[PDB]
């Protein structure tokens, strides 16, 4: 069990409707700890724990510091979405759904963005109680999946349908099971 | 609140190896990486791009955050991180179908300080070709999880294990995973 | 080229 | 890639004018825009810092304009003294480096009320052998041209100040080895 | 205020050097530039502490820079160039790499091929002509430095024992003896003007010294000519009625 001591820095960006609302917070942190803090919001730099008491002090006794965080909203966050406009923000996968007996699992995997609606269909009435869905899950590789289960007792020839939208589709994808 | 949430600048550094970390994160997911030691820009966008980024931006804010370290480490009176106790979760990019190919997905979440062995046990034996990782990508807790990926054909006679092994854990963790 | 934050030194 | 370039290289004007230097960049992506001024034994010292999200920067005498897509910053300084008479130097931010141009020399020229041009003929208090010719009491204006002739040294203009009195007068000198025509590349119409 | 040692400094095509800079008290970051003849300053090094964060600007292997301290920092440059001759400037910051800097004075770096063209100055003073003294009721003294290489010079006037600063004009650069050379000797005038009054009295003193740099002590010279050390060389002349 060897000692280890880590710091982190954080500059995150908040965007809301495009770049109308942009909100940039920089974090200092020690061992998961944020010591200090520059909110655009607030305007200048803010203590997070006792270690960054003399910190937040001592930068905003700087004032070349304070306008290069102040304008770092706009050098730092609006700069970056537009080039976010042409390439990730134009990404989209189309999800495969496929459906497997256990309890019936609609398996939506390997789709872009994550915005999503999944829904279970018996004999084209919607299913609600009974309905387990996952949380979604992220891949890692810029692609997520999610399970959604249906509790079932199947009769005679009950079709089972699960009815998915998403960004990249323009007709949702209704997969069946008779 | 917000629409998107981007982290442009996720900056690491630990006394351990010493070693760091430099990630552009833009929704939770890992635009690209500098190599710290090779001294280059390493990129995972899952597209074509003319983007650029000079390396020495990292080098250089990683060597103020060393700097910092060093001095927050002495008015803590030396005050360490906790080794945190990992999670791991092993399952699969696509449904599994046997003899066409798929990809095993290992995710060690909630891992703190970030260093780990994360290796892939073929019945019992250290595999080496297909596997791939990802970066220490950052959690809102202010810790970390990773992802290690390996492409294999699924059939009905290959048992795999995630090996993860971490401070955290008092015995080299293995998660089970079977077709 | 992308733009990243940057962080300044403490008083040592 | 990223050079910066300063149009006005040389800039030779009279006192409490208003003058333009302005700056050139290649590459846009840039971090921070400054500008300082350089005098021969301190150094640099820093006039303006603007932001890459700034088009103005306004302070004092100085004014400076950014247009980061079109690689040009502008500096206007008014009412200039001999005071602020130095070279110029405008840098630009890559991030990682500082990137410098090659620098505007400035030299703002005091105003002689009453100039009184002419030439004299010095003596050497070593051996009375040794001659040197004098030119003092001239304009601002007058520019002072180097001899065509390869043996005979002809120095440029400076400007001495006189106690109290705020009397100056510029000087140049011309030697060899008479101090008749010795200013040959200086005649009368400037 | 950020200090850099030495002023000046002659070397020959093989020796070692070493660069000075004393930083402002509490900046972090420092910095180390180079800059030539008609050019803007050029990066070199950025420390962040004791460690640097930045060597990209260093250009050969020769080149080390070291901190020992977060503070005082030395530019040793070893098995040094014709073209390693320049003017190192040193800086300091209490921000990151975007902040404002502060520079120093800086060091006059001149590498010489050889030292045997070293020569110090000769200087003589002129005294003033009765022509301007009737016209003006001025009296322009000339100093003239000649015949000196290379071109670390300075230049002062002193009169009854007291450095002047008023009435004093001097070159901004030397002149090149013949300009096609590149090893030419070089001059730097100067000017005094006194009151003719003042000049017309027996009892003042006038000595102009010109502060050449030279060779060092330990640069052993093995030529006819007198070691060509650093030196002050005067010349003085006494008022007339």
């Given at each position: 069990?060897?000692e280890?001591?880590?710091?982190q ?13 942009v909100?940039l ?7 998961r700890?944020?010591?200090?803090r ?5 305007g200048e ?12 002090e001592y930068?905003?006794?700087?004032k070349?510091?304070?306008?290069r965080?102040?304008?770092?909203v706009?050098?730092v966050?609006r700069?970056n979405?537009?080039?976010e406009?042409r390439?990730?923000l ?11 007996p256990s ?11 994550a915005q999503?609606?999944?829904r279970?269909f ?7 109680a009974?309905?387990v869905?996952?949380?979604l899950?992220?891949?890692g ?9 249906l ?9 089972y349908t699960?009815?998915?939208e998403?960004?990249?589709?323009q007709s949702?994808?209704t997969?069946?099971?008779? | 609140?917000?629409d998107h ?11 351990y ?8 994160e833009?929704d ?11 001294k ?6 899952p597209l ?10 990292a080098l250089?804010?990683?060597?103020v ?7 927050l480490?002495?008015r803590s009176?030396?005050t360490?991180?906790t080794n945190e106790?990992?999670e791991v ?6 449904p599994?179908?046997l ?6 997905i290992?995710?060690v979440?909630?891992?703190?300080p ?5 290796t892939?046990?073929?019945?019992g034996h250290?595999?080496?070709?297909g596997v791939?990782?990802?970066?220490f990508?950052s959690?809102?807790?202010?810790s970390?999880?990773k ?5 294999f054909?699924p059939?009905?006679?290959e048992?795999?294990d995630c090996?993860?092994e971490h401070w955290?854990?008092?015995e080299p963790?293995?998660?089970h995973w079977?077709? | 080229?992308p733009?990243?934050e940057?962080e300044q030194?403490?008083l040592? | 890639?990223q050079e910066?370039?300063?149009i ?9 004018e ?6 050139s960049?290649?590459?846009s992506?840039?971090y ?5 001024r350089q005098?021969?034994?301190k150094?640099?010292?820093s ?7 700034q088009?103005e920067?306004t302070?004092?005498?100085?004014n400076?304009?950014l247009?980061?897509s ?8 008014a009412?200039?003294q001999?005071?602020?008479?130095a070279?110029?130097?405008?840098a630009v931010?890559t991030?990682?480096?500082l990137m410098?141009?090659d620098?505007?020399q400035?030299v703002?020229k005091?105003?002689?009320?009453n100039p ?11 051996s009375?052998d040794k001659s040197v010719?004098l ?9 002072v041209?180097?001899?065509?002739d390869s ?5 440029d203009?400076?400007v001495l100040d006189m ?6 007068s ?6 060899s080895?008479?101090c008749?025509?010795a200013f040959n590349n ?5 | 205020?950020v200090?850099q040692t ?5 070397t ?6 070493e ?11 420092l ?8 050019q ?6 950025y420390?962040q502490?004791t460690?640097?964060?930045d060597?990209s ?5 020769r ?6 301290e977060?503070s005082?920092?030395?530019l ?6 014709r073209?390693?001759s320049?003017?190192?400037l ?5 921000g ?5 800097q502060?520079f120093?004075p ?6 010489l ?10 200087v003589?003073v002129?005294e003033?002509?009765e ?7 001025k009296?322009?003294?000339?100093c003239?430095?000649?015949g ?17 600063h ?8 030397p ?9 030419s ?6 000017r005094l003007?006194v009151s ?6 027996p ?9 050449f ?6 640069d052993?010279?093995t030529q006819?000519?007198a070691?060509?050390?650093?030196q ?5 002349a006494?008022?007339?009625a």
């Amino acid at each position: 069990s060897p000692e280890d001591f880590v710091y982190q820095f954080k500059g995150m960006c908040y965007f809301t409707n495009g770049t109308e609302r942009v909100r940039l917070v920089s974090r200092s942190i020690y061992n998961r700890e944020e010591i200090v803090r520059f909110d655009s919001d607030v305007g200048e730099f803010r203590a997070v724990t006792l270690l960054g008491l003399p910190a937040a002090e001592y930068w905003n006794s700087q004032k070349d510091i304070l306008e290069r965080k102040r304008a770092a909203v706009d050098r730092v966050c609006r700069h970056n979405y537009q080039l976010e406009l042409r390439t990730t923000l134009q990404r989209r996968v189309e999800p495969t759904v496929t459906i497997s007996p256990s309890l019936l699992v609609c398996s939506v995997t390997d789709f872009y963005p994550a915005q999503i609606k999944v829904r279970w269909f018996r004999n084209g009435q919607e299913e609600t109680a009974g309905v387990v869905s996952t949380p979604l899950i992220r891949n890692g590789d810029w692609t997520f999946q999610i399970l959604v289960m249906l509790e079932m007792t199947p009769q005679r020839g009950d079709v089972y349908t699960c009815h998915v939208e998403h960004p990249s589709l323009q007709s949702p994808i209704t997969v069946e099971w008779r | 609140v917000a629409d998107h949430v981007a982290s442009y600048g996720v900056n690491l550094y630990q006394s351990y190896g010493p070693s760091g970390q430099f990630t552009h994160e833009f929704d939770g997911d890992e635009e690209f990486y500098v190599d710290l030691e090779r001294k280059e820009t390493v990129w995972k966008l899952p597209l074509f791009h003319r983007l650029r980024f000079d390396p020495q931006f990292a080098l250089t804010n990683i060597a103020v955050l060393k700097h910092n370290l060093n001095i927050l480490i002495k008015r803590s009176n030396s005050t360490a991180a906790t080794n945190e106790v990992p999670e791991v979760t092993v399952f699969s990019k696509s449904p599994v179908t046997l003899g066409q190919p798929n990809t095993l997905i290992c995710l060690v979440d909630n891992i703190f300080p970030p260093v780990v062995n994360i290796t892939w046990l073929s019945n019992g034996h250290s595999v080496t070709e297909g596997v791939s990782e990802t970066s220490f990508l950052s959690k809102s807790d202010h810790s970390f999880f990773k992802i290690s990926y390996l492409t294999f054909l699924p059939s009905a006679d290959e048992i795999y294990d995630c090996k993860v092994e971490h401070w955290g854990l008092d015995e080299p963790l293995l998660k089970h995973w079977e077709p | 080229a992308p733009f990243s934050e940057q962080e300044q030194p403490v008083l040592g | 890639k990223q050079e910066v370039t300063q149009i006005p290289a040389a800039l030779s004007v009279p006192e409490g004018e208003n003058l333009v230097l302005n700056c050139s960049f290649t590459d846009s992506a840039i971090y921070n825009l400054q500008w300082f001024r350089q005098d021969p034994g301190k150094g640099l010292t820093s006039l303006l810092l603007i932001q890459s999200s700034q088009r103005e920067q306004t302070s004092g005498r100085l004014n400076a304009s950014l247009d980061k897509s079109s690689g040009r910053s502008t500096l206007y300084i008014a009412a200039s003294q001999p005071g602020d008479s130095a070279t110029y130097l405008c840098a630009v931010h890559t991030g990682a480096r500082l990137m410098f141009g090659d620098g505007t020399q400035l030299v703002v020229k005091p105003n002689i009320q009453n100039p009184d041009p002419a030439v004299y003929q010095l003596r050497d208090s070593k051996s009375s052998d040794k001659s040197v010719c004098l030119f003092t009491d001239f304009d601002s204006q007058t520019n002072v041209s180097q001899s065509k002739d390869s043996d005979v040294y002809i120095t440029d203009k400076c400007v001495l100040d006189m106690r109290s009195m705020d009397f100056k007068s510029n000087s140049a000198v011309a030697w060899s080895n008479a101090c008749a025509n010795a200013f040959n590349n200086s005649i009368i119409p400037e | 205020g950020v200090s850099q040692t030495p002023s000046n400094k002659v070397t020959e095509k093989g020796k070692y050097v070493e660069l000075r800079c004393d930083p402002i008290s509490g900046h972090t970051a420092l910095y180390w530039y180079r800059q030539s003849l008609g050019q803007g300053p050029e990066f070199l090094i950025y420390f962040q502490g004791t460690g640097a964060a930045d060597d990209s600007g260093l250009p050969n292997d020769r080149f080390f820079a070291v901190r020992p301290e977060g503070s005082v920092s030395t530019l040793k440059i070893q098995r040094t160039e014709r073209g390693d001759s320049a003017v190192y400037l040193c800086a300091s910051s209490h921000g990151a790499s975007t902040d404002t800097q502060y520079f120093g004075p800086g060091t006059r770096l001149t590498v010489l091929e050889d030292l045997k063209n070293v020569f110090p100055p000769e200087v003589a003073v002129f005294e003033p002509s009765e022509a301007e003294i009737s016209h003006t009721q001025k009296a322009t003294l000339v100093c003239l430095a000649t015949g000196f290489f290379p071109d670390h010079v300075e230049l002062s006037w002193w009169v009854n024992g007291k450095e002047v600063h008023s009435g004093v004009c001097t070159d901004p650069q030397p002149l090149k003896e013949q300009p096609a050379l590149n090893d030419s000797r070089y001059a730097l005038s100067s000017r005094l003007r006194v009151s003719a009054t003042f000049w017309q009295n027996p009892r003042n003193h006038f000595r102009c010294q010109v502060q050449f740099y030279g060779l060092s002590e330990n640069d052993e010279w093995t030529q006819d000519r007198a070691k060509p050390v650093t030196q002050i060389v005067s010349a003085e002349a006494w008022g007339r009625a």
